[PDB]
Amino acid sequence: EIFELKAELNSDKKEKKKEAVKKVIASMTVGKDVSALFPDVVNCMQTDNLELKKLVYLYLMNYAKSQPDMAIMAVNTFVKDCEDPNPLIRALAVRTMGCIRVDKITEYLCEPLRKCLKDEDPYVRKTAAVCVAKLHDINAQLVEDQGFLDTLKDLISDSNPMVVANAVAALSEIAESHPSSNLLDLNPQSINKLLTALNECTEWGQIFILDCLANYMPKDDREAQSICERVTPRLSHANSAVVLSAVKVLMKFMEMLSKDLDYYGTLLKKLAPPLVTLLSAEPELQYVALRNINLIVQKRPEILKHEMKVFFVKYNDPIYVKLEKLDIMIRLASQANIAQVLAELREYATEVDVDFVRKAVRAIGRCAIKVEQSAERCVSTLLDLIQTKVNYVVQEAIVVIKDIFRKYPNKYESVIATLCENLDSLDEPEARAAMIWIVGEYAERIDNADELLESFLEGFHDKSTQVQLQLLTAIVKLFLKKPTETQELVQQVLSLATQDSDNPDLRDRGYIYWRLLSTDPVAAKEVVLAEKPLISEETDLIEPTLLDELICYIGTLASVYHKPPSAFVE
Amino acid sequence: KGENTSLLHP
Amino acid sequence: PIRLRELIRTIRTARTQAEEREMIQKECAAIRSSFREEDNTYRCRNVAKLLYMHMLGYPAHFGQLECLKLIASQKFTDKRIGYLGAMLLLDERQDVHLLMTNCIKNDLNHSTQFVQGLALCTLGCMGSSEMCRDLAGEVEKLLKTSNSYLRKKAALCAVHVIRKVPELMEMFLPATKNLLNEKNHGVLHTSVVLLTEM
Amino acid sequence: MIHFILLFSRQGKLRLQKWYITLPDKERKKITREIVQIILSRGHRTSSFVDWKELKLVYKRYASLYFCCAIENQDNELLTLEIVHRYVELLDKYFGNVCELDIIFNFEKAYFILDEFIIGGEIQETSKKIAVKAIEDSDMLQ
Amino acid sequence: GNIFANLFKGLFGKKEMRILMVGLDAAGKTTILYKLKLGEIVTTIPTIGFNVETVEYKNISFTVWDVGGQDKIRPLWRHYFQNTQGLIFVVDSNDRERVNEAREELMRMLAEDELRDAVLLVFANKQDLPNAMNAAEITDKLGLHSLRHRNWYIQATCATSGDGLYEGLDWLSNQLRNQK
Amino acid sequence: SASAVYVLDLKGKVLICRNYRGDVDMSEVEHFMPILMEKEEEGMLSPILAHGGVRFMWIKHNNLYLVATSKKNACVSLVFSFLYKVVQVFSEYFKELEEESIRDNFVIIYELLDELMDFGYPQTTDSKILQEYITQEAPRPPATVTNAVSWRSEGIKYRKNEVFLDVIEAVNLLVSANGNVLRSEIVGSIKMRVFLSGMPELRLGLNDKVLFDNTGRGKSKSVELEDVKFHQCVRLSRFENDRTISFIPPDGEFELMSYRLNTHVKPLIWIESVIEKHSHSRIEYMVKAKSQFKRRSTANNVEIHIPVPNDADSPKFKTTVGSVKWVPENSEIVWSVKSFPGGKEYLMRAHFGLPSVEAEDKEGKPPISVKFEIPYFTTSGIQVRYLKIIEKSGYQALPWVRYITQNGDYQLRTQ
Amino acid sequence: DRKGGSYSQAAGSDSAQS
Ligand SMILES: Nc1nc2c(ncn2[C@@H]2O[C@H](COP(=O)(O)OP(=O)(O)OP(=O)(O)O)[C@@H](O)[C@H]2O)c(=O)[nH]1
Numbered sequence A: 001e002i003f004e005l006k007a008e009l010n011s012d013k014k015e016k017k018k019e020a021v022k023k024v025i026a027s028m029t030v031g032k033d034v035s036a037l038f039p040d041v042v043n044c045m046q047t048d049n050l051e052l053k054k055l056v057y058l059y060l061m062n063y064a065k066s067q068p069d070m071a072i073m074a075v076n077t078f079v080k081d082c083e084d085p086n087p088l089i090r091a092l093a094v095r096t097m098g099c100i101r102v103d104k105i106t107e108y109l110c111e112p113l114r115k116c117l118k119d120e121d122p123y124v125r126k127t128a129a130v131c132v133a134k135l136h137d138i139n140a141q142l143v144e145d146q147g148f149l150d151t152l153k154d155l156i157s158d159s160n161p162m163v164v165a166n167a168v169a170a171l172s173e174i175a176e177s178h179p180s181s182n183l184l185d186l187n188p189q190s191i192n193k194l195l196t197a198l199n200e201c202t203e204w205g206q207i208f209i210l211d212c213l214a215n216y217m218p219k220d221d222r223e224a225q226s227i228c229e230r231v232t233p234r235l236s237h238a239n240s241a242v243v244l245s246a247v248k249v250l251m252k253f254m255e256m257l258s259k260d261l262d263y264y265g266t267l268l269k270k271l272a273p274p275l276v277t278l279l280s281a282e283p284e285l286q287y288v289a290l291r292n293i294n295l296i297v298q299k300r301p302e303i304l305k306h307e308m309k310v311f312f313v314k315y316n317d318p319i320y321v322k323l324e325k326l327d328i329m330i331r332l333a334s335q336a337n338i339a340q341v342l343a344e345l346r347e348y349a350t351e352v353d354v355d356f357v358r359k360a361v362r363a364i365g366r367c368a369i370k371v372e373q374s375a376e377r378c379v380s381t382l383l384d385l386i387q388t389k390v391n392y393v394v395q396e397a398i399v400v401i402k403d404i405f406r407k408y409p410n411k412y413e414s415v416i417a418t419l420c421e422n423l424d425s426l427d428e429p430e431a432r433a434a435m436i437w438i439v440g441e442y443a444e445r446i447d448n449a450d451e452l453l454e455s456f457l458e459g460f461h462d463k464s465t466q467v468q469l470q471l472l473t474a475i476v477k478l479f480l481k482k483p484t485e486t487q488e489l490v491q492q493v494l495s496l497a498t499q500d501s502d503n504p505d506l507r508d509r510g511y512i513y514w515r516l517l518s519t520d521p522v523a524a525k526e527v528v529l530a531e532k533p534l535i536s537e538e539t540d541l542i543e544p545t546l547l548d549e550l551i552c553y554i555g556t557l558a559s560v561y562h563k564p565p566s567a568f569v570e
Numbered sequence B: 001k002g003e004n005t006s007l008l009h010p
Numbered sequence C: 001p002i003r004l005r006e007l008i009r010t011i012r013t014a015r016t017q018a019e020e021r022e023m024i025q026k027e028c029a030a031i032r033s034s035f036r037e038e039d040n041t042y043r044c045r046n047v048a049k050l051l052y053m054h055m056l057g058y059p060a061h062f063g064q065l066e067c068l069k070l071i072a073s074q075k076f077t078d079k080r081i082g083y084l085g086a087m088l089l090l091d092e093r094q095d096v097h098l099l100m101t102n103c104i105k106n107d108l109n110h111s112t113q114f115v116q117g118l119a120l121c122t123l124g125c126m127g128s129s130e131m132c133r134d135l136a137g138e139v140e141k142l143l144k145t146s147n148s149y150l151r152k153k154a155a156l157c158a159v160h161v162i163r164k165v166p167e168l169m170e171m172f173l174p175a176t177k178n179l180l181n182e183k184n185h186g187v188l189h190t191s192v193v194l195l196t197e198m
Numbered sequence D: 001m002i003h004f005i006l007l008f009s010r011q012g013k014l015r016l017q018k019w020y021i022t023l024p025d026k027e028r029k030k031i032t033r034e035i036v037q038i039i040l041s042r043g044h045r046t047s048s049f050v051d052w053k054e055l056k057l058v059y060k061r062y063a064s065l066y067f068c069c070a071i072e073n074q075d076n077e078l079l080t081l082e083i084v085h086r087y088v089e090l091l092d093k094y095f096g097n098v099c100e101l102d103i104i105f106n107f108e109k110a111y112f113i114l115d116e117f118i119i120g121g122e123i124q125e126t127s128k129k130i131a132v133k134a135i136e137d138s139d140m141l142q
Numbered sequence E: 001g002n003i004f005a006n007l008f009k010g011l012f013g014k015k016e017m018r019i020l021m022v023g024l025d026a027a028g029k030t031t032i033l034y035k036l037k038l039g040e041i042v043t044t045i046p047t048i049g050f051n052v053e054t055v056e057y058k059n060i061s062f063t064v065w066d067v068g069g070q071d072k073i074r075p076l077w078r079h080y081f082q083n084t085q086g087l088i089f090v091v092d093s094n095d096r097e098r099v100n101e102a103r104e105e106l107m108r109m110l111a112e113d114e115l116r117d118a119v120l121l122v123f124a125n126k127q128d129l130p131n132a133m134n135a136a137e138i139t140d141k142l143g144l145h146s147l148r149h150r151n152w153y154i155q156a157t158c159a160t161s162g163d164g165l166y167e168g169l170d171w172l173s174n175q176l177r178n179q180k
Numbered sequence F: 001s002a003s004a005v006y007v008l009d010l011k012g013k014v015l016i017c018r019n020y021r022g023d024v025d026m027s028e029v030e031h032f033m034p035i036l037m038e039k040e041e042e043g044m045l046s047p048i049l050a051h052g053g054v055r056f057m058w059i060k061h062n063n064l065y066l067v068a069t070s071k072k073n074a075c076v077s078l079v080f081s082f083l084y085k086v087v088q089v090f091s092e093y094f095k096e097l098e099e100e101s102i103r104d105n106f107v108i109i110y111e112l113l114d115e116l117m118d119f120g121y122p123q124t125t126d127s128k129i130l131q132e133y134i135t136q137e138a139p140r141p142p143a144t145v146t147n148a149v150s151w152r153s154e155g156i157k158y159r160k161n162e163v164f165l166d167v168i169e170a171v172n173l174l175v176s177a178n179g180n181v182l183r184s185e186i187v188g189s190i191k192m193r194v195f196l197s198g199m200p201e202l203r204l205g206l207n208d209k210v211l212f213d214n215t216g217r218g219k220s221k222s223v224e225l226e227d228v229k230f231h232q233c234v235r236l237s238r239f240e241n242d243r244t245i246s247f248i249p250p251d252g253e254f255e256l257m258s259y260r261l262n263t264h265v266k267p268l269i270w271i272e273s274v275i276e277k278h279s280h281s282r283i284e285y286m287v288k289a290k291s292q293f294k295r296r297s298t299a300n301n302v303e304i305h306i307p308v309p310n311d312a313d314s315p316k317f318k319t320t321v322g323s324v325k326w327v328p329e330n331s332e333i334v335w336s337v338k339s340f341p342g343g344k345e346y347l348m349r350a351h352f353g354l355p356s357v358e359a360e361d362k363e364g365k366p367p368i369s370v371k372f373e374i375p376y377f378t379t380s381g382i383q384v385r386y387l388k389i390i391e392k393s394g395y396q397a398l399p400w401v402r403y404i405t406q407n408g409d410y411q412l413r414t415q
Numbered sequence G: 001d002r003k004g005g006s007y008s009q010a011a012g013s014d015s016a017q018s
């Protein structure tokens, strides 16, 4: 096996060498440690066949880190191959030189990199730029000493527009890892030159060209208007990444754009068809499009005011896609489409996904809380969900009702009777605590509040800390409101939570309640059963500083994660 | 394979 | 009448999880169609396929009446298939073993030793709170038998009844008296286990 | 007694399953998945004894398909291993050169042998030849 | 296609038919089934589960699945209603207290869309004491005339004597089979 | 900015991997499978995985997951576009997407992967360009990639200049269970298979509403596409300037334009579904389909899928037009129709029993979707004006195009 | 013939637009 392969590789037969190389490649791909045969293949490296040269280069690249000492016998071969007349051979040699993770290998490759920097072939120029970028990433000091920054900068203002885009991407990558000192920013002539070559750049070069504009900050309305006009044709590109880059560039330029000028209105009008087109991309890109829309929603929410039908989650849509659609609908919910949102939530509540059902219930509750015009509709939907006889659905409806009571309890007295007998046997702490709080705060429309609380007092001392606190608060509120039917209940609750309750916070709360009851029961009504102020709901909108930063970082991994770029990288 | 082998090899 | 071996070979031939699920669904549909006509000739193959699917993680709610019907049958293979179905897919929480009490009582007095032993094993494996109440008398009757091959089964049934119904152990106090001279190792082990459980 | 005994392959496929405790189907599936994950995530020097859910989870596989047992903490651990070895020997004698392929094809025979050997989690046949003779006689009935 | 085999089978008799065993517990359903199958008054314990048997008469094998009238077995009667073409009801003429329960059970069973093509078959059980009602009083009490789209026939059968079983079997065969 | 892109398998084995930056260790792929298994078992599985500080974005392929591990905050959209381009290139080169071709063309696969991207930045993405320089059965790189026109190879010579167009129409209707259509959008598809000599520059011209309004002819039937996406060869400058669709057609089948706009017209097929399901006794399928399309248009190969019960068995179909077949694998009955002329009314009456034992858990109500495809029908009414085929040498072209209307997201909400 | 609509000849431009 290994001995036979070594003997075949140490032979003078081209067919045998090719067969040995193919076997070694197959073994390496299958999970075989062929690094021990790297020195043997070093001798059989300078071959006229292009197929064997590629395999040898791949083996050296994959066996360079494993055997750095054995990689010292390839500098001469790389130097010889760097002057090959065939552009493909030169490009392969340039790629292999930058792909070798050898500290002492890149030092001797500086001369070949300098020689290939001025390559006339656009593919050769792109390969040289890629090798320079790889060397700078591996050794920034080596790249600076070699002076490749000037060559990379001059590559942008040359021909080979794909080569220019490759050089621009390499320069941005070098500056991306740079500490921002000596940046490669260009004047408006550079931006105009890039825009002129933008229409001639390929799909990959278009992204590189648009990436440079993401860092440049426009300073004049005329320059911003020209940039917006140039980027407008980019929205009619079949490439999803190119469309996303153009949208991000337009959003960044809109920060300095003037709302009085008609350019902003035209950009907003032309952005909606782009968002609609992006929403119908592949499932892998659907999540990215949803994240981009959510990030840009907080910036210009009026752009997608009428985009509500497309936000509906399809039957075959993925769970991530459905969640993104639900989040977009919640963020884009409005009174105009309140009925549509309610219908979608009711339809979405009939699915078999427990997590999906919970997300739909949360979105419906958020929509009901945000818009008070649909409070009655939200209450009716919650009542229907509770009557649907679903444990998870019942818990979600109970949580929504409890949240609405604390937010809009002025007209919530018509649901206490319906919620009084609503299969209260559920032991879920989130639903149980919400029901207890609703009963305690709304202990006016229910004539059997004491009877209902009697069943929950059997295991008050061992139910839960939060549940016990909620039950104690409800008992105290009932005693303050109607102590004739709860005089003994309050004493029993105080005894259970004061003597049989070992919780520190719960014990302190029980002692405080007992002291208040024994000091001034009349004052307890104005102290315990007081009119709480308006509940400050947590705003879901991101901070303006983060929103502005997220506008520039469009299409990156941070946009999907909704985290700052420096808070997600390692 | 490994499935046709005897459980105890006896 | 698809054999269990053919179903196993077809399942092994499937690679994708979705493809395996589709094959299992087709097999279950075929089994349900065969059962809906009240088929009794190839019931053994359908029962084996359903048991394999249930063990593989396939639903078998519709294949509950077929096992009960095969249990009350007369074929030895059909009786074994029904007993296996009752032991595997039948439980106290299932609620489908309530009708099996009459079948167990009828098979409790069966002359065949394999049928009686299989019924006793099924009762022990799927002991219920109400099944033991209506079957406690039958278990005690077989505890006094002189069958070495059935003494262990009777002891196991009594132990299962005692574990499920601790209040029924009072009826086994005189049944195990004078049973320490059993020559068979199994009978002596069963008696010792019953005494330890008591 | 043995709460549940299941024979699972190395790849995770289950070749046998016999639970003496009535549990929900979803709960039983979750317990089986957890047991498979614990066995699949255990080394060869773990003593073949795991105290999972207050149950003596004893895992000892002599081939690619492994076997697991769940007994209460009231008896010695070596007894479970001895019973497993005796059952494996009895199955090998009844079948003859038992392999993974034969186990899948002989699932009904293996279940019948297990039922005739242990019922309700307790040992029912102490002898090795009497149980084999009884199994052969039952099979010959038809 | 060809139906020569079907004609040959039908020339010598091929039809079998089906039947069900329903009624109140201790109403002679098991005794009636034993008499129909075997022909003797066999003493049996309460029907905790069910009794399955077949009866061959007039070249028709009408299988009868006896089901008890116990509370734990009353809800189980729906399991035997699947793939069932006939149903036999056992009444307790000597059990006045259980007469209302039997009538309620019969009404509940007849109020199912699945059991719609099965004709009514009520057997006047407990026909051994003077307290047993006639073929009209039992039908009037059970309201058999108010069952629309149901072919119900009143037959009196005594478990100890066995008389009237042939008449009920003939009525059931006429209701099910309508051939020469 | 993925560190390394690798091709996985259904069993977790990596069919082929190729590191591009080297900042991510190759051993992180092994932990990807357990993470995916945990996410699937808990519902947290996502295409973009995250192994600590390195994100392993994966795409579910036909037989293996295209896992592209990344370390820094690289462009997720760019990575997805590169993965899609690689998948398209593999599909063009290899007709089968499975493990059969993964281990059979590794020698050319490695070269294609090396030439596609370097240092995480894709460089080559044209299938024809890649095949002209990398073959599985090497010369200098073609000048087409270096030249501006990378979508139309020069020097192509053909005996005849014939271009086959395809007016693909996707009729997507989202009818809720209440009977009202929520999402009714029709997405156009202008795909042309140009096979001529040279590199002609197509001059696309159609009865566009915007073009008609600009030219003053905004009074006839003009198609107003809400979203129109041009192909790679289509110049966006001309379209933005005066809607001039001038671009070099590709060598072969390519998508020039793809219209996308909402539809405010009635559905081509109106399906009324009735569920007379008894309580564990029987089930009724009162399915009635009404053809709202023009009578002159016939829907060929119409397959209206009606989801039947999961545990339903012994079903009987009582229909009038079209055969109904119940597929146990699909757990539904599809109302297959060979030819469905416009205005046709097909009524079906399903009847099957149900098991006595009730189901332990609910199965949901999947929507009912049809597979109707009526060609030679232009529902949108957009008519192509002309196609400006111009060549430097000068030749007479004979382009052809066919309008095909099919059913896309035509799902009807169940009751 | 071919399913999905027979191929039809296309013009070069809108002759009525000059
Ligand atoms: N002595 C006597 N008993 C009768 C007569 N007719 C009906 N019975 C009653 O019918 C019962 C028959 O019981 P079984 O053989 O077990 O069948 P069953 O009627 O379904 O009763 P269960 O098994 O308890 O459901 C006897 O217990 C009698 O009380 C009769 O003519 N004479």
Ligand SMILES: [Mg+2]
Binding pocket: E029, E030, E044, E045, E046, E047, E051, E066, E067, E068
């Ligand atoms: Mg009876």
